[model samples]
Target: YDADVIVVGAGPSGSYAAKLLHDRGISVKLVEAKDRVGGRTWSSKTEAQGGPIDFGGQWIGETHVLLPELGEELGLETVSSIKPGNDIFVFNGQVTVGEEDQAPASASWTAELTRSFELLDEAGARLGWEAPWASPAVEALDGMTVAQWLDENVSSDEVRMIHEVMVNILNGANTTEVSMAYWAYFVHQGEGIESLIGTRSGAQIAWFVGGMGQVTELIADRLGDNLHLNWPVTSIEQQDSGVVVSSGDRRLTAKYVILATPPSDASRMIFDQPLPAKRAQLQARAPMGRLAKIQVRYRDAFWQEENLSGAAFVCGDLAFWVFDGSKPSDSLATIVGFIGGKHLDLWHSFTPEEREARFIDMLVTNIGEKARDTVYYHETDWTEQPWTGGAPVTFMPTGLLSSSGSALRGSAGRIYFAGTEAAPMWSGYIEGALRAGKIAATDIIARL
Candidate 1:
């Protein structure tokens, strides 16, 4: 089958492109490898303790313009995040809700966290929004990991520990793997990405109430019969005149093609001639972020009785992050745990039963002794999944955006680049995904 345009990967990028082009009377054939769409942004059907939980990507900030707009256009409603968190500090198995601020230990930690943010934020402000990644500021912040930068700025061990945990949660990689400059930029960007904290009304951290997959389905419905599933395009042959794409026995011909897969998948695709030096370098420089979503369904919100908000975070353990998942439905309390970077490798090696047992052990240890009785648990293997090698895209040791980011976005013959990475504002976010899709659609519309 052939079309004027063929968008590969039905993630936000590919789906949005297809929606826009198809609306404009362009014949767009969107393809995805998964049985369902929404890419990484999906909610699971399994219930835990009478409530349903989101197994995959959850949370949308008020700052997300494109997502909100898309949700509105698709006739979906978005609620906000849960409110009134405990706001405590947990260290060495000890929990303190009202943390001391001015004590020698407390004062020192506060100063360090403050200083680190100061250094990074000042640079980001100078760069502003015009073109953050392209600014020389990235070069200035290059080569230094966030941890190294934190070390240089913060003096207290307590402050350092808190900073490390924050770094892990934000990027899913240790400070040593990510740039200090990138971290600050990312932190500042967070001001516009998602709230630094969630809202009480459940809107700040809100996603589609039904499921994020609903967004993809809404867009997919717009594609009508012009879409294909289970057809993962393996190659795009960019000839001088047009382009040819192949997936299994099916061949699609188009004047233009937008590669909407994650950077990891993009790195492995076949090109007609050898890719340009810049594009090749960009692909080689693609930074992979460590991220996985594990879902557990248990009888009700058991931990809530102990004053838990369906949230428990434990450092130096297997389950570093777990969230309350009794939403979009209230049949059970679903919990989602994020495992990534160093921890991701460790967990992925375990058997499913082993993984579940370990997860429960951590929760029980942190919450109470009665945690063993909870049931119905499943994990999302995003990395092991075929198309997407990981969950969210987090940058690496810098220099790529500062050095080769431009080349990655440039057109190679009739083929163009599009994905979260190509986005200038929010490189590793849902907003970035939508931005890249629109940009790619515009390019294809103009050229093809």
Candidate 2:
């Protein structure tokens, strides 16, 4: 065998697992389809600020253990997300500005929103983080979609739209596209809906200095020549003693194989002996969410002067979430926009130039007319990125979870799985990726 373990996909999960195995005196060969180490996390220098701009998986929460601790060890610093100003909420063309903890205008609206959170809190408490499918009411919960849940529970259009945007931003999937049971499980992972959505106390708390990709690069640098880039695995053949992972004509043999890619990407790889029925079906059924990230750089921080947080949730077909992306000493304004869920389809229908223009117009509408003048505009449509297939994370549709959730972390022969989606906690986040990698590495260590 060429190595003790062959880890496919050089994202955080694969990189972390390979590094851990190497530190334990085990030989590892890390293979990645993309030219870079990070899978969905990519960063580059923009001509506008000459600083790092992360296009994927940028933030780390305060409660995240692995990534933040790893960052400290790697000499990487974390920067708090800017959250000093008021937030903008636009519904039916009416723009309302409120503080971070402000309630809706109508008292009845507040009651409905509170009820919605109470419902999610109840569900989260009932379903824990581990195996949502093991719940006794899994069948009943999985039978309904998030859209149906909202309709049955929420009556206010305002509250419904807020929840819709919340779900969209959470998984890049609209309410109608995600299973209610899966949604509840996701909320449960965060401990509640507030912890999942809040910027101060939630998953969007802080980001790495240079970019989130720097973490992966640091680990890959230590791996040296053991890490292979642009080598997309096409097949896996499990032999009597080891497994052979093949990419094109090249093949690498190992005692164990860790597939660290998302379920959607994993489904594309062929196996000589097919995976277990439920496992294969889970991969085939899990679909990546529709998401496009847009970054607009300006000459000044105009929104700051207006007392706006640059964080806006829209009700129409526009940027669903907008936030300030500027550093302390940045001379220019940086606003990051997310167009996802059903709106992503609408954004994709237009040409690149058309999308850029429309997004600027959206900024002006959401913020102020000062957004008309922009120094640079760049957009990354993850759905079009052949390597990633989609952004944020892949999710299960109705009935899929109830049928195949058990296979999420179940290994087949010498094959193991590790990714954000497979993590027992904080799934779909950078923290989860590291946690999942550790899990796979631990499993392989026990076997060896």
Candidate 3:
């Protein structure tokens, strides 16, 4: 049970690599540890009112060159994200309109944030989305955490909270854990898109018609009989000639192996010739962002009554951002709430029923009483999922991007690792996943 190439993990990276190899007329065997594909990007039927709820990753935006290009090749459908008017802020307990202007508020501190952004933009513009960050230029913002950098940039707690919210929503990890250089580069990179950042016009958040899981199906369909599911690779040994991959009860051999799984699960796989200690450090130290998506299906989009937008970003214990999950119709909306960072661990401790109830309570407190009457809800527990330790890798923790980041995606003999977390631009996003796969595929193809 083997082929020319055995790709591990059926997420975006593995699937993309398989499609490219198969399209090139190469025999490719794609294996997934989970019964299904889509890795962290799984989407399915929400228990309640919406047509189909995207439980895992609902949005594909920010990074354009790689994602849209792949979408065109794959004929995947995409749409613009629902515009939720302007930014609304909840500083501590008070609700107020968020700052409209992007300009730094204080002259002295503003220059600091602006300087960081300028350096980031320069790096991003130079890197242009594909290549990794290189040189002594690496020290641009590598030493400090986003929270630490923000401290030097803004004195007001409100401003700091705003920055934290932005970073958290993007990666779902606490800002303090995110590397400043990575965040700066990501923001600068995503902002490089066509959209002006205010309007939802050029910036599009696309999803598959059936759900992104269909993406897994699409790639799997192309791989045909060469695809394997419910098969987890336990160890990878680099033999004298090629790489040997193993799962319980069965073993597969391939010339080249793609480590398409998340770093958490990938870290556990044993290497024949013990991998470089530094690579192990990079893998062990790589920032795996935290995020818990709680999907609450309601009878309808009741919050739209007060001209409420389909999205809500608030500072609360339950959800930092609530996205409208009603697709193709506004009659019903499945509220997809994001509970991330330290909060994710807390949410994981609660039972499903309790989590749902508490989430509803928070929505009611922030939005209105209508949220209290939510019909049914469910929490997607990523903690239980092997091969994927977390959702939408957040850039928490410093040093990953500067010192160890360069080796985060390196290959061990015939085995090469790839995932959104290893992306040069906007790591921990669906688009980034595509980008990483393309890069890994290009390298593996050359070696093969």
Candidate 4:
């Protein structure tokens, strides 16, 4: 056998799984399709004027466990994402500013939005933590998309639009395309809507000093020669003896195999005997959400002079969400913005120069005209990735989870599935990826 196990994909989950298995006396080989190590956590060290700017996953959530511990173990520095300034909200065309830590409570629909979040939490409480699909609510709850739920429950335009923007920025998909159960479970997984979007104590809590991608680079460095880049697995054949993993002309035999790629990306590979009916259906059905991160850099955080946080939530226009993206310690400033959900789909057709113009144009109205002074500009084109279909994570269609969710983590003969999507907690988060990877690794370890 080439090794005890072959871990495909070099994302956080795959790298972590391979590292654990290799450390625990198992001969594991890691393969990544991309030239880079971090899957969705790509960082351009020279992009921003301040520090390494993240073109992919960045923030470390508040309730996150494994990732934070891992960062500390690797001697990485962490800093709060929230600088001392007020947040801004844009509706139609008017802009509303808020004090530090204060929400846009002045809006008429603020109460409804708050109440809707409460209702969502209440509904999610029934789903439980371990298996949300096992709950009796699966039948009706998973039958509809968030758009349907919002239409039936929410009446105010402001509240609905605001909620959609939240879903857009968080899930990276249109509310109409996202399932209610999936969103609810995600909300619960993220420690509720408040913490999911919160900065000081929420999911957007903090980030690494250099870049979140640094963690994976460091992990890959530890793997050394055992880790192979530019190897896109094309086929996996599991026999009674072992699993055969092949990538073009190269092939390897292993006692077990862990596919730590996203389900959507995993669907690209061919399994010899084919996956179980439900598992195949689940992988084929799950789609990675769309998200494009646009980072606009500047000589300094000029908005601070105006008492703004460089954060804005756009309700009726483009630039779904914005936040302060400056490095922890640097003279430069970065105002990161997102083009997600339907907006990303629409903007995907626009030329790079045109898109930049529109993003800057929107920022002018929302964050003042200082936005035009962008010293550097960069955006991630997640759709172009062959190994990773998109950023954030994959999610179930309206009813796929209810039927095929059990197959999510179940081992398929010698093949084990590990990814942020299969995680029981913080699914779609770096924390989830770490936890899921460790779980699959531990499961294989017990068997060995």
C-alpha lDDT score of every prediction, in listed order: 0.67, 0.84, 0.66, 0.83
Superposed model 2: Cα runs more than 4 Å off:
46-50, 104-108
lDDT of 3: 0.66
Clashes of each: 15, 0, 5, 0
TM-scores for every candidate against the unseen true structure:
0.86, 0.96, 0.84, 0.97
Candidate numbers, best TM-score first, in rank order: 4, 2, 1, 3
Ordering by lDDT: 2, 4, 1, 3
**lDDT by residue (tens digit), candidate 1, 1-448:** 3787888888887888889899888887887877777776776434434543455566776667888898899987776556334423445555544221111334335555566556656766755544556776678776677777776777766556666655665566777788766666666655632243232322236767777777777887778777788887777787776778888677888778888876667777777777787677777666666677777666666665766554544555343665665564556566666776656667878888898788887666555665677766667766666677665565657665566656645467777777766665655667777888898888888875
Give the RMSD in angstroms, all C-alphas superposed, for model 3: 4.0
What would the per-residue lDDT of candidate 2 be over residues 1-448, giving only the tens digit for each residue?
Answer: 8999999998898889998999999999999998898988988655345478887878888788898889998899888884687787777667877666455465447777778999977876666777777888678888889999998888998789888888776778989989998888888887678777775567778888888888889999999999999999999999999999999899999999999999989998998899999889998998889888889888877887888778887776554788888876566678998878888877878998898788887888778888988887788888877678687888889998888987877489999999888898888887888888999999999999
Roughly what TM-score does model 3 have, to 2 decimal places?
Answer: 0.84
List, residue by residue over 1-448, the lDDT tens digit for candidate 3. 2666788889988898788888887677888888888888776655345566666775655446776677666787776565453334454545553333233253333444455445445644653444335645446566778777777666655445545656665666777777777776566546642231222333345555657777777778777778888888888888777777888668888888888877766777777787777667776776566776777767777666655554545664433666666665434557777777766766778876787677777677455778877666777765566667776663536666666566666677787878776666656667767877887788877876
lDDT digits (tens) for residues 1-448 of candidate 4: 9999999988889988987897788999999998889998887667556677787899988778898898998799898887778887788767878767566677676788788889888777777667877989876889999999898888888778778888877888889888888888888877788887775567888898888888889888888988999999999999998999999989989999999988888898999899998889888998888888888888888888988887877787564688887765766788888878887877887998899898898888767888888887888777777677876678667988788877777589889899888788788889988988998999999887
The candidate that achieves the highest lDDT relative to the unseen native structure: 2
CA deviation > 4 Å runs, candidate 4: 317-319
